[PDB]
Enzyme design. Structure first.
Site, mmCIF file in Angstrom:
data_model
loop_
_atom_site.group_PDB
_atom_site.id
_atom_site.type_symbol
_atom_site.label_atom_id
_atom_site.label_comp_id
_atom_site.label_asym_id
_atom_site.label_seq_id
_atom_site.Cartn_x
_atom_site.Cartn_y
_atom_site.Cartn_z
ATOM 1 N N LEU A 172 0.715 -1.282 0.145
ATOM 2 C CA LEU A 172 0.163 0.074 -0.096
ATOM 3 C C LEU A 172 0.890 1.004 -0.014
ATOM 4 C CD1 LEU A 172 -2.532 -1.228 2.450
ATOM 5 C CD2 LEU A 172 -3.205 -0.445 0.033
ATOM 6 N N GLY A 178 5.155 0.991 5.641
ATOM 7 C CA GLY A 178 5.975 -0.283 5.742
ATOM 8 C C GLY A 178 5.312 -1.515 5.120
ATOM 9 N N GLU A 179 5.509 -2.625 5.939
ATOM 10 C CA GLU A 179 4.902 -3.872 5.508
ATOM 11 C C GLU A 179 3.611 -4.024 5.493
ATOM 12 O OE1 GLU A 179 6.899 -6.800 3.910
ATOM 13 O OE2 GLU A 179 7.778 -4.780 3.522
ATOM 14 N N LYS A 185 -1.243 -6.180 7.494
ATOM 15 C CA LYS A 185 0.068 -6.037 8.151
ATOM 16 C C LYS A 185 0.900 -7.311 8.175
ATOM 17 C CE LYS A 185 0.842 -3.718 11.345
ATOM 18 N NZ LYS A 185 0.902 -3.044 13.026
ATOM 19 N N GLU A 196 -9.403 -2.879 8.624
ATOM 20 C CA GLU A 196 -10.207 -2.771 7.479
ATOM 21 C C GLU A 196 -9.376 -1.539 6.398
ATOM 22 O OE1 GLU A 196 -13.056 0.478 8.691
ATOM 23 O OE2 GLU A 196 -12.067 0.707 10.605
ATOM 24 N N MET A 235 -8.969 1.565 4.244
ATOM 25 C CA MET A 235 -9.417 2.870 4.039
ATOM 26 C C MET A 235 -9.115 3.377 2.647
ATOM 27 S SD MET A 235 -10.766 3.215 7.107
ATOM 28 C CE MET A 235 -11.030 5.079 7.062
ATOM 29 N N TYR A 264 -9.400 6.100 0.614
ATOM 30 C CA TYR A 264 -8.722 7.315 0.308
ATOM 31 C C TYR A 264 -7.364 7.462 0.805
ATOM 32 C CZ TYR A 264 -12.654 8.861 -2.495
ATOM 33 O OH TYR A 264 -13.646 9.118 -3.531
ATOM 34 N N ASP A 322 2.257 8.645 17.667
ATOM 35 C CA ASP A 322 2.464 9.039 16.278
ATOM 36 C C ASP A 322 1.184 9.950 15.866
ATOM 37 O OD1 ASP A 322 3.498 8.044 13.052
ATOM 38 O OD2 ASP A 322 4.705 9.045 14.566
ATOM 39 N N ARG A 354 -0.610 12.266 8.314
ATOM 40 C CA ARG A 354 0.189 11.111 7.730
ATOM 41 C C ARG A 354 -0.536 9.621 8.393
ATOM 42 N NH1 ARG A 354 6.361 10.504 7.653
ATOM 43 N NH2 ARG A 354 5.642 9.205 5.824
ATOM 44 N N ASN A 355 -0.795 9.914 9.520
ATOM 45 C CA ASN A 355 -1.018 8.584 10.426
ATOM 46 C C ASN A 355 -2.683 8.353 10.500
ATOM 47 O OD1 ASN A 355 1.568 7.420 10.386
ATOM 48 N ND2 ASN A 355 2.047 8.644 12.215
ATOM 49 N N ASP A 362 -3.854 2.728 14.372
ATOM 50 C CA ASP A 362 -3.682 2.154 15.992
ATOM 51 C C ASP A 362 -2.150 1.973 16.007
ATOM 52 O OD1 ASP A 362 -6.277 1.814 16.366
ATOM 53 O OD2 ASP A 362 -6.181 -0.150 17.204
HETATM 54 C C1 LIG Z 1 3.188 -1.248 9.857
HETATM 55 N N1 LIG Z 1 2.520 0.163 9.611
HETATM 56 C C2 LIG Z 1 1.232 0.381 10.130
HETATM 57 O O1 LIG Z 1 0.634 -0.407 10.787
HETATM 58 C C3 LIG Z 1 0.535 1.587 9.952
HETATM 59 C C4 LIG Z 1 1.259 2.973 10.129
HETATM 60 C C5 LIG Z 1 0.581 4.197 9.820
HETATM 61 C C6 LIG Z 1 -0.794 4.219 9.214
HETATM 62 C C7 LIG Z 1 -1.422 2.894 9.291
HETATM 63 C C8 LIG Z 1 -0.871 1.876 9.461
HETATM 64 S S1 LIG Z 1 -1.777 0.193 9.142
HETATM 65 C C9 LIG Z 1 -2.733 0.688 7.543
HETATM 66 C C10 LIG Z 1 -2.114 1.072 6.421
HETATM 67 C C11 LIG Z 1 -2.900 1.435 5.236
HETATM 68 C C12 LIG Z 1 -4.186 1.474 5.243
HETATM 69 C C13 LIG Z 1 -5.289 1.534 4.326
HETATM 70 C C14 LIG Z 1 -5.060 1.989 3.120
HETATM 71 C C15 LIG Z 1 -4.010 2.895 2.442
HETATM 72 C C16 LIG Z 1 -4.184 3.271 1.034
HETATM 73 C C17 LIG Z 1 -2.845 3.950 0.842
HETATM 74 C C18 LIG Z 1 -2.861 5.051 -0.359
HETATM 75 C C19 LIG Z 1 -3.891 4.549 -1.327
HETATM 76 C C20 LIG Z 1 -5.167 3.727 -0.861
HETATM 77 N N2 LIG Z 1 -5.045 3.030 0.139
HETATM 78 N N3 LIG Z 1 -6.448 1.045 4.915
HETATM 79 N N4 LIG Z 1 -6.170 0.385 6.258
HETATM 80 C C21 LIG Z 1 -4.888 0.554 6.394
HETATM 81 C C22 LIG Z 1 -3.960 0.236 7.573
#
Ligand SMILES: CNC(=O)c1ccccc1Sc1ccc2c(/C=C/c3ccccn3)n[nH]c2c1
Length: 276
Positions: free
Chosen positions: A16, A22-23, A39, A84, A86, A88, A131, A135-136, A149
């Site tokens: 993503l 990250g992963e 994740k 879930e 997201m 956008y 954090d 961006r988060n 989370d």
């Molecule tokens: C290991 N990193 C994380 O857990 C983390 C850190 C910061 C913010 C989120 C996460 S986990 C995460 C990341 C992306 C998502 C998305 C969607 C991402 C996305 C990004 C660009 C375009 C469309 N979709 N839905 N749910 C998500 C959960």
């Protein structure tokens, strides 16, 4: 454990957001045709306990404006935490690329109200967020905004959480007491929330633009604060400035902040309908 799933229910796709999280991979929960975020954790790792900790936290947390855990696969080498999806992406990029006629003043208020709601929940639960930033935050349909989370930590004692030794945090979002001492309280989160409010008000401009990282702490210590962005309502800027009180105890709680935004959001909504 009720949360366990079988990994073959998931069809994994690409990473993503170009790896910015990250992963984390886009995935499909086959038997619902539901896109999900997954994740993952390599098997060759020393972070298994931390990763399980993240999952355990996600099990305990539930709120409409916190990204929801859907399931885990944690009995077989590539561990999964499924949340879930997201659609956008992160709120920072969303604000930068959006149609400002759709995402107008009232929407900005709505986004702030949602995030403050999530934070008030965490406040009551004795959690802190390491954090808190645009961006988060993640954005779904209908300007639904959820805090991720990632960065959540529970306070076992007292009101302070100490980040792992040597930790380095983004200066421009971090409360001065956290920069100075590595202590995060819910009041540190109130500071970060004020900065987030500024990110929202400017449609994703970087904070302290043009100011070098090395000067930020001293400047804050000497009462420098970002000025009101054009378009920002005075009440919102005043709250922003309340969030940036030097003394943590002088900052409002998230209960007070959420209530202030709820009230402003309602008045704008009421005044909006009244105009016909
Ligand atoms: C290991 N990193 C994380 O857990 C983390 C850190 C910061 C913010 C989120 C996460 S986990 C995460 C990341 C992306 C998502 C998305 C969607 C991402 C996305 C990004 C660009 C375009 C469309 N979709 N839905 N749910 C998500 C959960």
């Amino acid at each position: 454990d009720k949360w366990e799933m079988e990994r073959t229910d998931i069809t994994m796709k690409h990473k993503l957001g170009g790896g910015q999280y990250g992963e984390v991979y886009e995935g499909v929960w086959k038997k619902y045709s539901l896109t999900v975020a997954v994740k993952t954790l390599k098997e060759d790792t020393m972070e298994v306990e931390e990763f399980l900790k993240e999952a355990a936290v996600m099990k305990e947390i539930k709120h409409p404006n916190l990204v929801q855990l859907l399931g885990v696969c944690t009995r077989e080498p590539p561990f999964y935490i499924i949340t879930e999806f997201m659609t956008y992406g992160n709120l920072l990029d969303y604000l930068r690329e959006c149609n400002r006629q759709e995402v107008n003043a009232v929407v900005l208020l709505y986004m702030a109200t949602q995030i403050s709601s999530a934070m008030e929940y965490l406040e009551k639960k004795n959690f802190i967020h390491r954090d808190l930033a645009a961006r988060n935050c993640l954005v779904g349909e209908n300007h639904l905004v959820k805090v991720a989370d990632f960065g959540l930590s529970r306070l076992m004692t007292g009101d302070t959480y100490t980040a792992h030794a040597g930790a380095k945090f983004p200066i421009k979002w971090t409360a001065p007491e956290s920069l100075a001492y590595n202590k995060f309280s819910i009041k540190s989160d109130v500071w970060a929330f004020g900065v987030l409010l500024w990110e929202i008000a400017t449609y994703g401009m970087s904070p302290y633009p043009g100011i070098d990282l090395s000067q930020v702490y001293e400047l804050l210590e000497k009462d420098y604060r970002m000025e009101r962005p054009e378009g920002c309502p005075e009440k919102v800027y005043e709250l922003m400035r309340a969030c940036w009180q030097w003394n943590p105890s002088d900052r409002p709680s998230f209960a007070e902040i959420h209530q202030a935004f709820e009230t402003m959001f309602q008045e704008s909504s009421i005044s909006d309908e009244v105009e016909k």
